[PDB]
Design a protein around this nucleic acid. Sequence first.
RNA 1: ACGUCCGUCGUGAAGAGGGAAACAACCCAGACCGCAGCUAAGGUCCCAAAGUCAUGGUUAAGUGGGAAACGAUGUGGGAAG
RNA 2: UAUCGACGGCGGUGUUUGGCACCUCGAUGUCGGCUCAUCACAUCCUGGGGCUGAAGUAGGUCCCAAGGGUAUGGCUGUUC
RNA 3: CUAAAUGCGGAGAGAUAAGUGCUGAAAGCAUCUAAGCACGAAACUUGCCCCGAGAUGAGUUCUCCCGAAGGAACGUUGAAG
Lengths: 209, 167, 142
Amino acid sequence: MIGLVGKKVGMTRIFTEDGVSIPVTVIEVEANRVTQVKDLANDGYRAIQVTTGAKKANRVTKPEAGHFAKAGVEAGRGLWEFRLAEGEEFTVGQSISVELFADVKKVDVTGTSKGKGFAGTVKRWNFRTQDATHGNSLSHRVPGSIGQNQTPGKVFKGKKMAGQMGNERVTVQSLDVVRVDAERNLLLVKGAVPGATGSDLIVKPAVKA
Amino acid sequence: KAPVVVPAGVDVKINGQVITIKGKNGELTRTLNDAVEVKHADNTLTFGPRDGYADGWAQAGTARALLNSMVIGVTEGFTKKLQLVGVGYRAAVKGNVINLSLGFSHPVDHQLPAGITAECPTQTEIVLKGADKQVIGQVAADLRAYRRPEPYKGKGVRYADEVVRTK
Amino acid sequence: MKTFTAKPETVKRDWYVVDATGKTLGRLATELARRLRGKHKAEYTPHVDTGDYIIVLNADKVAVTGNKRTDKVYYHHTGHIGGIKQATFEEMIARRPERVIEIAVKGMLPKGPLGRAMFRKLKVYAGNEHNHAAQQPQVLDI
RNA sequence: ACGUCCGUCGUGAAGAGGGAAACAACCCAGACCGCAGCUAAGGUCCCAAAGUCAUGGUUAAGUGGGAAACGAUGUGGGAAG
RNA sequence: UAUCGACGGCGGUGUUUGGCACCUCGAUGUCGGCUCAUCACAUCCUGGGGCUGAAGUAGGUCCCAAGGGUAUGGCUGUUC
RNA sequence: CUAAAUGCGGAGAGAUAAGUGCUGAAAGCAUCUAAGCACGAAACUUGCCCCGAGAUGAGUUCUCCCGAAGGAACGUUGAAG
């Protein structure tokens, strides 16, 4: 069980004696039924599924191992009914969050940040903005220069512009686990978590805390 | 064909394209594969192709040179004596990295290739000995190379440099 | 005019082999690759699958002509130009054989044109009898 | 100067056919229909019909020839003091 | 011979001008600007180097290299 | 919803040129080369983000299914358009 996964519910907060008041993001972490686990290998730098472990297959778990010893194994995802899990497959695949999750423990939560169509350079890849009177010239979120040397009237592919997005993966580290509570088996993560509500976020023991 | 007599303190055995020389200092195995057949006679190693083409003489001059090199490197060995000098700030040369070169705060170093010993006694002389020749020559050359003024400052004014005393 | 069997051609799926062992590599390019679309049966048309998976015995002993060596070269790679050539010798890539008698019977797609699909059919590999061990159905011998 | 302006001649214009990768005037060559045969030009590894022909030698650059004035112990052959 | 560099000689480009006039002459809206897209380099730097009349610093000149960056304004419609 | 608002946007690894060297001949010396070899550029490849089975080596997995499994039509609303 390299980690668990839940669905973002929203953002709340819990004032704890130790530490100090800090917003907490509620995440629904519940019953799953992992039938198999797909393992990827790092051939150069292009993910490829080595093998898949079923309810009973020592011929695939063996390759999974060793490859891990070779450190060539990539991210691990397994055919699941609801959400993922690792060593959970070997048992029966049926498990609850209570089995994997403790509080006050550090965890790395990654996820795809929240279709928005085309956006302006600024609202887009964080481009700053026309500070100074530049803003007064109502030219707020515009680079003002598509590219140097009008000739070519071309914009260097580099010279970042506007485009499409939405519909970026980010793995924030050191996310303390406040507690596991709510109407349903959920999780309280300190601070905020990438992605919108309902989005699928994964948990993983902090690589370095 | 160029017969090469072998010293009394040298024993060479060949199996195919592989030639192994044995002695006191150590052993060195080398591979010589070309349009020629190198064989070892009880008292002499023979090298003699069938054709006398230019390219054939080229591989003949190097082969004999390489063999003779494997002989000396087993009876005598390869060692280079180097000495450090510095007018002003003493350059501390350690088995790891040299420090305080000309007064620079950052140390200048170079990775020691292969497996040779560069024992440096706390004085002016240091020694770099090994079994491989291309290795003992590279490390010795690089040690002086880094002592070469990187900035656009000519020599003469900057004496500090660890040159090789004997080859 | 119209005579097509139910979808597709996989049930009771045919299959054929050859003796990659000894003989010209040229006249091995043809055949095999003609066992696919229009194997030579009254079940062609052409728009659905046919690819009749073939098998290769040993691809290591397969010797070429006694004249052409570092004469023919294959350019394998993709991406930017004027960078990596990756021009190796035939009897150099012989370290295999896995990617050889499949590099051929591979050049005829011609360009999607249904041919991508055509590849996983055959299974090139060096060996012999205990090589056809994989894939387990009845038996022939051309 | 795919320039003007003359002269001789052959052609473009009524030259088809064939070669030259494609091509008005470059090379061969000049036609009724149908049929058989042999050649011209050109070509004979494959696409493409025909030798992946024979003896000998040179080049390694893939040179496969804009490519110049100019330069060149890259390399081969020959002669002379 | 760092750098500058005559006389003379030999060339490349074809952006200028001149020439010819072979082509078009059975009509493809002007100049400048603006807006927007792609390509090139005879690199002004950044990067790695050579020389210096190179102490250092700051420069001058030259080589490889264009990957990116090479981008703006005041007067004038004005291109010097 | 927006902005003169706010949070986020690496490092590292690999390979040649100029060039610096090693071993080493043709010219038994010498020589970075001619065979071989150690290093060596912001750029290049990769990392990372986004799209993507019409990614023509045209994908993978599980289950259901060949007279009944499954599926389309409708109604009430949108974290949708």
